[PDB]
């Protein structure tokens, strides 16, 4: 109720859950994440 | 209820879940993610 | 209820789920993602 | 009720859950996360 | 009730849960997390 | 009631729960966490 | 009632729960945590 | 009622609970925790 | 009623509970904890 | 009523509870704890 | 009523409860505890 | 029931049911009256 | 019930049910009257 | 009930039910009248 | 009931039920009238 | 009941129920009238 | 009841119930009228 | 009841119930009328 | 009752109930009318 | 009752009940009318 | 009753009840009308 | 009653009840009308 981010990760190897949230009445350039070199 | 991002990742190897959320009344250039070099 | 992004990733190798969301009353150039070098 | 981020991680190996939340009436460039070198 | 971040970690090996929360009426560049070298 | 961060860690090996919370009427660059070298 | 951080740690090996909380009317650069070399 | 941090630690081996709390009307750079070399 | 930090530690081996609390009207750089070499 | 820190430690081996509390109208750099070499 | 720190220690082996409290109208660098070499 | 008034998000007033489950690697072996995994 | 008034998020007024479960590796073996995993 | 007035978050007024459970590796063996894992 | 007035967070006025449980490795063996894990 | 007035956090006025339990490795063996783990 | 007026935290006025329990390794063996672990 | 006026913390005016218990390794063996672990 | 006026901490005016118990390794064996561990 | 006026700590005016008990290794064996461990 | 005026600590004016007990290794064996350990 | 005026400590004006007891290894064996350990 709000931003509910769960993770379960059963019998896993290498699991992660990243979350960002930038709330404002005014916000100059809010990033969530930086640059990615390699993905997946 | 809101932004609900779950991950389950069963018997997995290398699982991730990235989320960004930039809410404002005014926001100059909100990125979510940077540049990707390689994907998948 | 809202933006619900789940991932399951069963017996997987290399799974990811990226999400961006830029809500505003006014937003100059909101990107979601940067440049991709290679995809898939 | 609010941002509820749980993790369960059953029989797992290498599980993590990162969360950021930048609330303001005004915020110049709030990041959530820095640059990623490799992902997943 | 507020930001409730629980973790359960049953029979696990290597589990973590990181959370940041930067509330203000005004905040110049609030990060949540620094740069990541490798993820997952 | 407020930010309630519990951890249960049953039969676990290597479990941790990090939490930061920077509340202010005004705060120049409040980080939550520093740079990460390796994650998960 | 306030920030209630409990930990249970049943039959565990290596469990920890870190919490920071920096409340102010004004605070220049309040960190919660320093740099992490390795995580999880 | 206030910040209530309990720990139970049943049949455990290596359990800890760290908490910091820096309240002020004004506080220049209040950290909670220093740098971490290895985590979990 | 105030900051109530209890620990129970039943049948345990190696249990600890650290707490800091720096209240002021003004406080230059109040840390709670120093640097950590290894955690968990 | 105030900061009530109890410990119970039943059938335990190696239990401790550390608490600091630095109240002031003004306090330059009040630490609670020094550097930790190894934790948990 | 005030800071009430009790310990019960039933059938225990190695139990301790450390408490510090530095109240002032003005106090330059009040520590509570020194450096820790190993913890838990 | 009452009205629901959102700009940027779900204004549900009806019987809104979300479910995410995983029944991965799960084996239902009933001789009689078995139901497994009913996510409505 | 009463009205719900959000700008940026779920204004639910109805019977809103969220569920996330995992039934991974779970084995239901009833002879009679077994239900397993009913996430509504 | 009464109205609910949010800018940036869930203004629930209805019967809002959140659940997260894991039934991983869990084995229900009833001869009669067994229900396991009912997350509404 | 009374109204609820938030800017940045859940203004619940209804019957808000949160639950997180884990039933991992848990084995329900009733001959009659067994329910296990009912998280509403 | 009375109104609830928050800027940055949950203004609950309704019947708000939070629960976190773990029923891990727990074995319910009733012959008759057994309920185990009812987290509402 | 009376109003509740917070800037940065939960202004609960309703019947707010928090619970955290662990029923780990716990075995309910009733012949008749057994309930175990009811965390509301 | 009377009003509650906080800046940085829980202004509860309602029936606020917190509970933390552990029922770990605990075995309820009633023949009749047994309830174990009721944390409201 | 009277009003409660805090800046940095819980201003409870209602029926605030905190409980922490442990029922670890505890065995309830009633033939009739047994309740064990009722932490409200 | 009278008002309560704190800057840095709990200004309770209501019926504030704290309890910590341990019922570890404790065995309730009533034939009739036994209650054990009622921590309100 | 009269007002309570603290800067740094609990200004209780209500019925404030603290209790800490341990019922460890304690065995209640009533045939009729036994209550053991009632910590309010 | 009269007012209570503290800077650094509990200004209780209400019915403040503290109790610490231990009922360890204690065995209540009433046939009728036994109460043991009532710490209010």
Author numbering:
A (entry chain E), B (entry chain C), C (entry chain A), D (entry chain G), E (entry chain I), F (entry chain K), ...: 85 to 124
What does the paper say about this structure?
The human nucleoporin Nup98 forms fusion proteins in certain types of malignant leukaemia, is a critical component of the permeability barrier of the nuclear pore complex and is mislocalized in cytosolic deposits in Alzheimer’s disease. Key to these Nup98 activities is its large FG-repeat domain with a high number of FG motifs. The most aggregation-prone segment comprises residues 85–124 (named Nup98FG85). All four fibril types display a parallel in-register β-structure comprising short and kinked β-strands.
To gain insight into the molecular organization of cohesive FG-repeat interactions, Nup98FG85 was allowed to aggregate in pure water. EM revealed the formation of well-defined and mostly separated amyloid fibrils. Using cryo-EM, we determined the structures of four different fibril polymorphs (pm1–pm4). Polymorphs pm2 and pm3, which are almost equally populated, were solved at a resolution of 3.3 and 2.8 Å, respectively, and are formed by two protofilaments. The most common motif shared by the four polymorphs is a 13-residue β-turn/β-arch structure. A leucine-phenylalanine pair (L91-F92) is located at the tip of the β-turn, with both side chains pointing away from the turn. The other LF motifs in the four fibril structures show a very similar structure. In all four Nup98FG85 fibril structures, side chains stacked along the fibril axes build glutamine and asparagine ladders (top). Most of the stabilizing interactions arise where there are clusters of two to four phenylalanine rings and one or more leucine side chains. We obtained values of approximately −20 kcal mol–1 per chain for the four Nup98FG85 fibril structures.
